[PDB]
């Protein structure tokens, strides 16, 4: 279901901007999880270009130049 599916994501900021932050941050902390940003709300949190709209060319460029 949609709230169990958005809280079970491979990106803990996406699952922490949404409902309960305690459960998700302890799960991510004891798992040692890492957030390869790669979505819209991680980049709205961290303050950069959205990887969808005009910023999709910027993220193509950055993903190409690694």
């Amino acid at each position: 279901g949609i709230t169990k599916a958005s809280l079970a994501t491979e990106s803990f900021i996406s699952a922490a901007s949404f409902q309960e932050t305690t459960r998700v941050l302890t799960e991510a902390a004891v798992a040692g999880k890492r957030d390869e940003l790669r979505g819209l709300k991680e980049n709205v949190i961290v303050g950069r270009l959205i990887p969808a709209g005009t910023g999709y060319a910027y993220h193509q460029d950055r993903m190409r130049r690694r």
Binding site: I2, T3, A5, S6, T9, S11, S14, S17, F18, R38, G39, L40, K41, P51, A52, Y56
Partner: protein
């Protein structure tokens, strides 16, 4: 209530009829003013489950897609096929209903001209590409979505 409100608004409502009317209208105001919270929380859960999915290819390279038929509950045919297969790219090439003809090819967007040539031939159901059958890792390819819808 077994006794109706026989008076309209041009004639005057008396007291009891207006009080029954206020039952019926207070229920509607309470429903809207409490319904809006669930509507907003539904939009929040939906944009946080979506949140990631970006059109990131041009063809996933598949042949699978759902079978769009017109929907029929048991009364007259409710939503026609031209409402469901308007601007969605077909999965395999639709056979013309006569015999084994290539009526439309297998990767054509069905805009209004194609849908009119579908309605003239009375096409049964179209196997069309759906987003849930898209083979793209981390996103949806450009054909399995469909038409832009405002472009």
């Amino acid at each position: 209530i077994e006794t109706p409100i026989t008076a309209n608004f041009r004639e005057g409502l008396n007291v009891l009829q207006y009080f029954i009317s206020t039952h019926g209208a207070r229920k509607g105001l309470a429903d809207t003013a409490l319904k809006t919270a669930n509507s907003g929380y539904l939009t929040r859960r939906l944009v946080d489950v979506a949140q990631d999915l970006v059109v990131t290819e041009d063809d996933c390279g598949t042949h699978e897609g759902i079978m769009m038929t017109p929907v029929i509950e048991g009364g007259d045919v409710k939503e026609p096929l031209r409402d469901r297969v308007l601007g969605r790219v077909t999965a395999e090439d639709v056979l013309k209903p006569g015999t084994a003809d290539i009526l439309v090819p297998r990767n054509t967007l069905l805009h209004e001209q194609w849908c009119d040539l579908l309605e003239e031939n009375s096409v049964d159901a179209v196997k069309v590409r759906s987003v849930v059958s898209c083979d793209t890792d981390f996103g949806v390819c450009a054909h399995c979505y469909g038409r832009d819808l405002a472009r």
